[PDB]
């Protein structure tokens, strides 16, 4: 006989609660911005404006009692805790000695990072991405980059998710020495310095919390009170649409690898491994961890770092220790967690790690079979060839010869096949290896006909510097261009060359190029024909499948060719 409560929606945070508490309106240290709680804190205001208020309240979710407390006036705030994410029909009843009166039910949201409170994501995928019926046992992976939401304008809902088995989310940095990040210019180092305030060295943080969880995405139905937004809420809704899709954070990458060189100290690994366990208990849509240390032994962005005696053993121990941690998570959750790593495949990268030892702890190795040549110097070559190109010298392919100064080759040439063969020869199983496809070209300028030693092959020429271009043509940094830019502005509809470019294909290497003879602009990339060759190669050798880098640069053609190559190789 009290008055039935009316819920005050706006005074109760619009009934949007969360096990994860996330700063939405500042940028500060990761530990100050993100706190995961085992029980969500719930606070619901209700009113009984007329009649008697009664003396006690009970709160029900789907008919089950979850809280009780005192009513002592016409406005009551019910505060309590609840441990399970989801949408629930809440009722609140007011009671006195004569009986109880129950509010009408209203949906309350308890957000959790597995996306249990979210409907499947609505997709907005370019229809140039076709449908395929590729065997679900074959890996078809890609990287999605956190910053792709800015100028590139490529969001989670744009991914052709039914054509993917694995999304690697790039990149998760590690706090500590990060001089390489500084060298990149822009805001990347400053963002990282902020994220690490109040964080121990060697622990992981989110690099860009605005992209990751604050940015409101209209297409995902985000509104002001949504407790998780950004890429991560979209990935959580994506897991609701595609529960078998694996989404894996990639830690490191070319510019964020500097802290890994301290993992020769076990205390640093322990700190890192513990922080990765916590990260996966916080962000539960993630299904494992990908380690992208570029590179054990050195030769990466950090010119003064690299230990060829100790980095390999440290990498193996890291993999062993991550696998131990992941087994604890598998025990705690009943889920499967994957451990993978993207690795350099030049012979001088491979020779610094016993991968046959490391891979016993891993589900997959993503072989970085790209970036073999590029704008960092003036030597053209195929950046992502399967085999040795016509432009290589006698003995250069297997490393048994000498260069044009007469200096001995130090090892086999950089090609996908040489890398894969080196890894198989160490005893890495073929069905653990995933072969990489590039969705971008690298490029030079100044490779004009007068520099060529063979007049029909621009790979025999010499450049004056990196390719220059604008972001409108897909050039986001000097010397690199999106595959979709190459297609729009160099190849054209018929794949025969536009704007002064001609197309060529080195059949021995399995590698395409476009070349503008007058500017001497030359771009090495992967196309439909080279990606079919890679699929046939993967099939022949019984590799795990294919992956690509990076998905925002594709227009559908590369991922389609990955699927086509994996169906049809003889
Ligand atoms: C050898 N490397 C590899 C890299 C690399 C990256 C990104 C940057 C680099 C890099 C950047 C600056 C450098 C500067 C250097 C150098 C090497 C590098 C260098 O030699 C000494 O002067 O993705 C992984 O592979
Ligand atoms: C592979 N390298 C060798 C270099 C180098 C230098 C100076 C710079 C580089 C460099 C710079 C940026 C790079 C960026 C890259 C890369 C490789 C490099 C890279 O591969 C992935 O993206 O003098 C000694 O030899």
Phi, psi of 525 (to 5 degrees): -160, 180
Ligand whose nearest atom lies closest to the CA of 299: 1
Cross-strand bridge partners of residue 408: 402
Q: Are strands 56-61 and 40-47 parallel, antiparallel or unpaired?
A: unpaired
State which approach was used to obtain the coordinates.
X-ray
Is there an atom of ligand 1 within 6 Å of 294 CB?
yes
Question: How many Å apart are CA 413 and CA 399, to the nearest integer?
Answer: 6
Closest CA to 440 of 485, 402, 388: 485
Whether residue 474 contacts residue 553, with contact meaning beta carbons closer than 8 Å, is answered with: yes
- 107: Cβ–Cβ under 8 A, 6 or more apart, which residues? 15, 87, 88, 89, 90
Please check whether residue 410 is in contact with residue 399, taking contact to mean a CB–CB distance below 8 angstroms: yes
User: Has domain 112-438+525-570 been given CATH number 3.40.50.170?
Assistant: no
Does the CB atom of residue 303 touch ligand 1 within 6 A?
A: yes
How many whole angstroms from 294 Cα to the centroid of ligand 1? 10
CA of 259 from ligand 1 middle (Å) equals 15
Q: Which fold has domain 439-524?
A: Chitinase A; domain 3 (3.10.50)
Tokens read off for 116: 């249990």
Q: What is the phi/psi pair of residue 552, to 5°?
A: -70, -20
CB 561 within 8 A of CB 525: no
Q: Which are the contacts of 45, defined by CB distance < 8 A and separation ≥ 6? A: 7, 8, 11, 12, 75, 76, 77, 78
300 CA distance to ligand 2 middle (Å): 7
Question: Could you list the active site residues?
Answer: 294
Pick the CATH number of 1-111 from 3.40.920.10, 3.90.1300.10, 3.90.1150.10, 2.60.40.10: 2.60.40.10
Q: What are the residues facing 46 on neighbouring strands?
A: 7, 76
- Give the integer Cα–Cα distance in Å for 280 and 38: 14
Where in the chain are all domains bearing CATH 3.10.50.10?
A: 439-524
Phi-psi region of 497 (alpha: psi -120 to 50; beta: other; left: phi over 0): left
Strands (E) in 157-287, as ranges, are 166-172, 246-253
Three-state secondary structure call for residue 350: helix
Ligand 1 and 306: CB distance under 6 A = no
HEC sequence for 517-551: CCCCEEEECCCHHHHHHHHHHHHHHCCCEEEEECH
The Cα–Cα gap between 534 and 321 comes to 33
Q: Alpha-carbon Rg of the chain, whole angstroms?
A: 27
Contacts of 360 (CB under 8 A, 6+ apart): none
Pocket lining: 352 vs ligand 1, CB cutoff 6 Å: no
Domain limits, CATH 2.60.40.10, in the chain: 1-111
């Amino acid at each position: 006989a009290p008055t039935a409560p009316s819920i005050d929606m706006y005074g109760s945070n619009n009934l949007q609660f969360s096990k994860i508490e996330l700063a939405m309106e500042t940028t500060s240290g990761y530990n100050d911005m993100v706190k995961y709680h085992e029980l969500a804190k719930i606070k619901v205001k209700f009113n009984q404006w007329s009649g008697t208020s009664g003396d006690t309240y009970n709160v029900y979710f789907d008919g089950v009692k979850v809280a009780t407390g005192a009513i002592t006036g016409s406005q009551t705030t019910a505060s309590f805790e609840y441990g399970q994410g989801g949408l629930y029909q809440m009722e609140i009843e007011a009671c006195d000695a004569t009986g109880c009166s129950k509010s009408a039910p209203v949906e309350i949201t308890i957000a959790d990072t597995d996306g249990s409170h979210l409907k499947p994501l609505t997709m907005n995928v370019d229809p140039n991405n076709k449908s395929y019926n590729t065997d679900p046992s074959i890996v078809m992976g890609t990287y999605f980059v956190e910053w792709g939401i800015y100028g590139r304008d490529y969001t989670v809902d744009n991914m052709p998710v039914d054509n993917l088995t694995h999304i690697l989310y790039g990149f998760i940095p590690i706090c500590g020495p990060n001089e390489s990040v500084k060298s990149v210019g822009g805001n990347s180092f400053n963002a990282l310095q902020t994220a690490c305030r109040g964080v121990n060295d060697y622990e992981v943080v989110i690099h860009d919390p605005w992209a990751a969880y604050q940015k409101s995405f209209p297409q995902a139905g985000h509104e002001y009170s949504t407790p998780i937004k950004g890429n991560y809420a979209m990935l959580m809704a994506l897991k609701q649409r595609n529960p078998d899709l694996k989404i894996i954070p990639s830690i490191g990458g070319g510019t964020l690898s500097d802290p890994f060189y301290d993992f020769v100290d076990k205390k640093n690994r322990d700190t890192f491994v513990a922080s990765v366990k916590k990260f996966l208990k916080t962000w539960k849509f993630y299904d494992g961890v990908d380690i992208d240390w570029e590179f054990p032994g050195g030769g990466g962005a950090a010119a003064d770092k690299g230990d060829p005696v100790n980095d390999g053993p440290a990498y193996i121990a890291l993999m062993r220790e991550l696998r131990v941690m992941l087994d604890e998570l598998e025990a705690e959750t009943g889920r499967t967690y994957e451990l993978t790593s993207a690795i350099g495949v030049g012979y001088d990268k491979i020779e610094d790690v016993d991968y046959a030892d490391a891979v016993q702890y891993m589900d997959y190795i993503f072989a970085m079979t790209y970036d073999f040549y590029g704008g960092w110097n003036n030597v053209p070559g195929h950046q992502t060839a399967l085999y040795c190109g016509s432009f290589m010298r006698p003995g250069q392919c297997d490393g048994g010869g000498v260069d044009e100064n007469g200096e001995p080759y130090k090892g086999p040439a950089y090609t996908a096949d040489n890398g894969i063969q080196l890894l198989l020869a160490q005893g890495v199983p073929a069905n653990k290896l995933v072969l990489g496809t590039a969705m971008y070209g690298r490029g030079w300028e100044g490779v004009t006909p007068d520099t060529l030693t063979d007049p029909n092959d621009p790979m025999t020429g010499t450049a004056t510097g990196k390719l220059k271009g604008s972001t409108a043509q897909g050039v986001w940094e000097d010397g690199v261009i999106d595959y979709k830019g190459i297609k729009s502005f160099m190849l054209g509809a018929n794949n025969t060359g536009i704007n002064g470019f001609e197309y060529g294909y080195d059949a021995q290497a399995e590698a395409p190029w476009v070349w503008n003879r007058s500017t001497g602009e030359l771009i090495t990339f992967d196309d439909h024909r080279s990606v079919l060759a890679k699929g046939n190669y993967a099939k022949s050798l019984g590799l795990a499948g294919l992956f690509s880098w990076e998905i925002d640069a594709d227009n559908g053609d590369i991922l389609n060719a990955m699927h086509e190559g994996m169906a049809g190789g003889v």
